[PDB]
Structure 1
Amino acid sequence: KVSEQLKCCSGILKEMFAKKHAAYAWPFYKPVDVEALGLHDYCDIIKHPMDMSTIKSKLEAREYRDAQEFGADVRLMFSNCYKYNPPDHEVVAMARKLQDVFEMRFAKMPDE
């Protein structure tokens, strides 16, 4: 069960990194570079930054022990975006679309 579920999760991660979703996934590929982006309050507002390269590193290194731990990280990434940004900002629109992809496929988890 655990192995299977984590495979399911790595498939989701591979999809989120895929070219078919790149038009809205790209802001989430790497850690937010607060300084480069001029976002000098980012650290002060976001206490636990998260991005898809960090999730991929944690998957490769077998840090996730179960699907719930992986999902909590992916959702944290979206929540940080909803935290920091006005809800009408383009990056929030892209986060919502990528979360739709994630939640619909995560729902299709093998459950035993």
Structure 2
Amino acid sequence: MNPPPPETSNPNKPKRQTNQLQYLLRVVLKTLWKHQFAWPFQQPVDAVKLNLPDYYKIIKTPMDMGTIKKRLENNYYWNAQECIQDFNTMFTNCYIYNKPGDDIVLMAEALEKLFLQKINELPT
């Protein structure tokens, strides 16, 4: 039931170390990582273990903070916007599969509120 996880290295792809990308790893991701609600989002959804055989029938572009962390550590991104997009894909997937008011949604919303606070100002 589990698909292969998103790639965390791609050589066909050009890489960049920007000040914003370093900050997204050192400050943004690491703060979110320690949040009390971060743990469901620290690795790909394990649909077999959660016995959610429908998850990957619905979610076709999965994303999680473990994948983002590995991408950042591998300089996988060209710019901060690409990384921010991965965060937003992660949150949106949770809002798509689940319903407003669900506990997992409350957790994603708390992480998203903090994410938006931390990315409001990025380095130059």
Q: Same fold, TM exceeding 0.5?
A: yes
Equivalent positions of 1:72-111 (< 5 A) are: 72-110=85-123
Superposition deviation, residue 8 in structure 1: 1.7
Equivalent positions of 1:1-112 (< 5 A) are: 3-10=18-25, 11-18=27-34, 21=35, 23-110=36-123, 112=124
Superposition deviation, residue 24 in structure 1: 1.0
Whichever residue aligns with residue 52 of structure 1, its letter is: M
Report the Cα distance in structure 2 between the residues aligned to 1:69 and 1:80, rounded to whole angstroms: 17
When normalised by structure 1's length, the TM-score is 0.90
Report the Cα distance in structure 2 between the residues aligned to 1:44 and 1:33, rounded to whole angstroms: 13
Report the Cα distance in structure 2 between the residues aligned to 1:60 and 1:50, rounded to whole angstroms: 16
Whichever residue aligns with residue 43 of structure 2, its letter is: K
Superposition deviation, residue 40 in structure 1: 0.9
Superposition deviation, residue 53 in structure 1: 0.6
When normalised by structure 2's length, the TM-score is 0.82
Superposition deviation, residue 67 in structure 1: 0.5
Superposition deviation, residue 4 in structure 1: 1.1
Superposition deviation, residue 45 in structure 1: 0.5
Whichever residue aligns with residue 89 of structure 1, its letter is: D
Superposition deviation, residue 91 in structure 1: 0.3
The percentage of counterpart residues that share the same residue type is 44
Superposition deviation, residue 86 in structure 1: 1.5
Gaps of 5+ in 2: 1-16
Count of residue correspondences:
107
Superposition deviation, residue 103 in structure 1: 0.6
Question: Secondary structure in 2 aligned to 1:49?
Answer: coil
